[PDB]
A paper describes a structure:
The structure of this form was refined to 2.00 Å resolution. The relative orientation of the dimer subunits in the L form differs from that in the S form by 2.6–3.0°, indicating that the dimer interface is slightly flexible, possibly owing to crystal packing. Electron density consistent with the position of a divalent metal ion in O-sulfatases was interpreted as Ca2+ based on bond-valence calculations. Difference density next to FGly70 in the active site could be modelled as a covalently bound phosphoryl group.
Mucopolysaccharidosis type IIIA (MPS IIIA) is caused by the functional defect of N-sulfoglucosamine sulfohydrolase (SGSH; also known as sulfamidase, sulfamate sulfohydrolase and heparan N-sulfatase; EC 3.10.1.1) and represents one of the most frequent lysosomal storage diseases worldwide. SGSH belongs to the sulfatase family and catalyses the cleavage of N-linked sulfate groups from the GAGs heparan sulfate and heparin. The leading cysteine is post-translationally converted to a formylglycine (FGly) residue, which is crucial for the catalytic process. Despite the low sequence identity between this unique N-sulfatase and the group of O-sulfatases, they share a similar overall fold and active-site architecture, including a catalytic formylglycine, a divalent metal-binding site and a sulfate-binding site.
Numbering used by the authors:
A (entry chain A): 22 to 504
B (entry chain B): 22 to 503
């Protein structure tokens, strides 16, 4: 049988040898990249953990699958009951399904796995960060195979921050299991220490000692994640199935630094993506330039198992259709895929800053539906040494070392248009430039067509109201906003 | 031998003889008022159907029970799994529970009823608006009583709008069951027609021909609701249990007109409230001046059945405690209750305009957490003839007959302070008046203390961030908000 393994880092970026970062040591991801197609232009559709995971596992944008924000405690979003997720369709077609690590989506009836070791039924630390334990669970999973195909989803909790939840293990949990007093030992992990001066400060991160100490800790933890990818792959090799298994490696959202996680800017939505098919070796070790979305993974995995997406409606007779496509053709030839979309509504339930985006190659358009209010900041990020330092400096009147200032981080234009080929840092908004008005109209039109097609309840916001029974279906509010 | 009946109108206001509206015919609500304490100053804590129903049935504000907006389809809010609602606690203590009508809350595990006829398992029209059907189901319920006390919740769908959902029955479904072609017959209902010139136009509603035709249809439907209250009470009398039954009549939110439903203004949150205890006749037919909240119903009903509220946490070890109180002492003496709170986060999921409020007697303070954006407008209200007419006129530059203009309806101050004893229409904002600063501080403070005490996730918004492990727990964002 064909099997499939999805490896997902949490808040992972491009800190790998495979993405040309020579400061970090990620031998196992580098070895995987040599047996993979590597995508330079992959994007998540949403820069929020639960919406991202839900969109990845359904192939529907968050506005359509119902996970409008975080899933846990107080935030409490869940996808619609009638949604047919990837693991549900795979089970119905006879594929054995497993998840180890952070799930962070619900309800269980929409995202059922036959074998499930997650934060719901055990320690996130043990099933998300202790790579020895993850190794042992992957082994248990493989040893209980029954000649059905399998789909195994390994959702690492590394390299997510711990400053909010678990401060004594350090800002990225880099001290958990490192064998120092009070930390325990993860016997399969060799900790890699980084000096703050050795890290690459990305362009959107302030270059200060506090941010550098933050990145050094992240690097150690990306290291633990990389070793975990090694262990997992080694278990599939020991069980003799690796050579029958599609391996995909990605991350759910951008790194938890300014302009990253929670933004539809490039740093918040750009994701590493490796795809390794044992049946398509032609392109192993090559780099694709095609513009692809995490919305493509569900149709890629259904394609691999030859399972159709069924025609159904979640509500009324609004039939659901996937807007992503299978990546499997890209394994044989380089395609001209150019367009990716973004949709975000909430992160935390108190953070209502809906954003819609479309990218056409190096051009990116963001629409900020709630732009008159300041951009909200999540609680986990707020206590980061990086945010603290930026805030402390901004208020004390000192230089921040940052490529923006807070005021403009908080108060954004309704429309932001950027050309990354000329302006890769996305600091020159072109939506106000009359030379770019025909492009701006072309992009707004594509984004709107996608919004309708995916049944976006925010399609008419903020200037209008959706009224499905009349033509035109967006009706004006005359609320002093552009229409 | 105590039982309890809760009668809840949907979007009902003060269109009754009991509230001295002389234009409408509500004989059955009037008769009930004669055997009740009537509250002049009762308020819902939230002006949205599912949040209101959830808060009423739990005694927790919406920000604490998890029903942050509407429950149905795309909006999809549910209360937290570990919440102990009124019907759950009543069942655990041995009280048989029933619901007939519009439930509009979830999940079923948090709001379980032994006998249940709702939108979940049948037509909302039949179990919410067809009073004959409702009469027959209350009869079935009573005929199947056993050893036990009962709690029966009858949640009428009248007088809610039908313009959005069910247009062919008229703007308030006033033609459904009226015996005309295509409409069917509700044999127990006598339809009452109103001329648009006979209705009372409330102060917050434009006095125009379109709005008057809108109110005339509402009146016919308030009439059907009143007749349904009559039938329900008559079934309890026929079964011989009315005299053992606490009857409460209220509504979930203000009327679906401008400044009403979805606002924390007086018109959106003020509710009719009748309480009739067969064991406390001293104040039957009287009017209380005490300021009370629909957050008080759950503790009132638990008090009636002598059931404690248990000590539990929904999350971690943040123990839940009710902030409302029992209304039963008010049946014996007039109390000095002065303070009522309001909390709204969403209505529709696309309508994020969180509002927090506190009222101290005739003073009201509203805090609009998202004030720099325009106030959103729900889809059902937008197609009302009343909103259409106001929008069309505003757009065409014609006089609106309205006490506000749209611009100021859309763009509100962060803090709105009003004194209804001098300014009942709430059009003179006093929050910027330095003479009123000490009162403004006193009220902000009370509202903040309630927010913490009820575990409000928005307690630090919009200028700060909640960080539970540091002191102070609200941490500043320096985002140009004061
Ligand atoms: C990570 O998980 C592994 C395996 O569960 C833990 O190692 C175990 O430690 C216990 C207690 O000392 C022993 O009884 C087991 O036999 C150990 N197993 C192995 C394979 O070593 C390890 O302690 C965990 N590390 C952390 C930091 O939690
Ligand atoms: C690993 O998997 C590949 C792909 O399934 C195997 O290579 C195929 O082997 C078959 C034998 O039935 C040939 O006819 C195919 O042409 C091969 N295809 C490709 C694309 O390589 C391979 O045998 C497997 N085993 C090892 C050790 O590599
Ligand atoms: C309102 O409810 C009553 C009771 O369900 C409906 O009357 C019943 O209608 C069915 C189907 O026509 C008959 O079989 C029953 O005999 C009727 N029962 C009674 C007591 O009359 C009535 O049709 C419903 N009205 C509307 C307008 O929907
Ligand atoms: C209706 O209810 C009231 C209150 O339960 C009953 O009045 C009580 O009568 C009983 C028995 O005589 C006594 O416990 C109390 O002294 C009375 N209290 C009050 C306030 O009246 C009355 O019995 C009931 N009527 C019927 C027909 O049963
Ligand atoms: C890394 O460097 C090489 C040579 O400069 C280039 O061809 C490759 O595409 C780069 N990698 C990525 C991930 O962009
Ligand atoms: C910033 O200032 C706060 C406020 O006193 C202080 O406690 C914190 O330790 C500082 N953090 C950084 C990164 O400067
Ligand atoms: C209505 O007016 C009557 C007679 O003037 C009075 O007794 C009663 O208090 C009033 N009802 C209300 C609800 O104010
Ligand atoms: C509002 O405007 C539209 C368009 O002119 C018109 O057809 C409709 O009847 C108007 N409605 C009201 C209530 O004025
Ligand atoms: Ca994440
Ligand atoms: Ca209502
Ligand atoms: Mg009973
Ligand atoms: Mg006007």
């Amino acid at each position: 049988p064909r099997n499939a393994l999805l490896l997902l880092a949490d808040d992972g970026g491009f800190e790998s040898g495979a993405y040309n970062n020579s400061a970090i040591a990620t031998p196992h991801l580098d070895a995987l990249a040599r047996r993979s197609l590597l995508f330079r232009n992959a994007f998540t559709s949403v820069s929020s953990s639960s919406p991202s995971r839900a969109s990845l596992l359904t192939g529907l944008p968050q506005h359509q699958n119902g996970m409008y924000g975080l899933h846990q405690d107080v935030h409490h979003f869940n996808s619609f009951d009638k949604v047919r997720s990837l693991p549900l369709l795979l089970s119905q077609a006879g594929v054995r399904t497993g998840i180890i690590g952070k799930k962070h989506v619900g309800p269980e009836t929409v995202y059922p796995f036959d074998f499930a070791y997650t934060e719901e039924n055990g320690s996130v630390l043990q099933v998300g960060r202790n790579i020895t334990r993850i190794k042992l669970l992957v082994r248990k999973f493989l040893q209980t195979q029954d000649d059905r195909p399998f789909f195994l989803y390994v959702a690492f909790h590394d390299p997510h921050r711990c400053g909010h939840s678990q401060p004594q293990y350090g800002t990225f949990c880099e001290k958990f299991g490192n064998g120092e007093s009070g930390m325990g030992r993860i016997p399969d992990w060799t900790p890699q220490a980084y000096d703050p001066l050795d890290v690459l400060v990305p362009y959107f991160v302030p270059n200060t000692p506090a941010a550098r100490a933050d990145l050094a800790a992240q690097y150690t933890t990306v290291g633990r994640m990389d070793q975990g990818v090694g262990l997992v792959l080694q278990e599939l090799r020991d069980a003799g199935v690796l050579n029958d298994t599609l391996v995909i490696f990605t991350s759910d959202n951008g790194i938890p630094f300014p302009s990253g996680r929670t933004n539809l800017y490039w740093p918040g939505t750009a994701e590493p993506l490796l795809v390794s098919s044992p049946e398509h070796p032609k392109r192993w070790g090559q780099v694709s330039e095609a513009y692809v979305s995490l919305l493509d993974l569900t149709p890629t995995i259904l394609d691999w198992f030859s399972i159709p997406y069924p025609s159904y409606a979640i509500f009324g007779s609004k039939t659901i259709h996937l807007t992503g496509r299978s990546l499997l053709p890209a394994l044989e030839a380089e395609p001209l895929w150019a367009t990716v979309f973004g949709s975000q509504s909430h992160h935390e339930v108190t953070m209502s800053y809906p954003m819609r985006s479309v990218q056409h190659r190096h051009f990116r358009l963001v629409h900020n539906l709630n732009f008159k209010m300041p951009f909200p900041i999540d609680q986990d990020f707020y206590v980061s040494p990086t945010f603290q330092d930026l805030l402390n400096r901004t208020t004390a009147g000192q230089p921040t070392g940052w490529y923006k200032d807070l005021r403009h981080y908080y108060y954004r234009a309704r429309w932001e248009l950027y050309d990354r080929s000329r302006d890769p840092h996305e600091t020159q908004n072109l939506a106000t430039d009359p030379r770019f008005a025909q492009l701006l109209e072309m992009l707004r039109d594509q984004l709107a067509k996608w919004q309708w097609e995916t049944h976006d309840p925010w399609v008419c916001a903020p200037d209008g109201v959706l009224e499905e029974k009349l033509s035109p279906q967006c009706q004006p509010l005359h609320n002093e906003l552009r229409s």
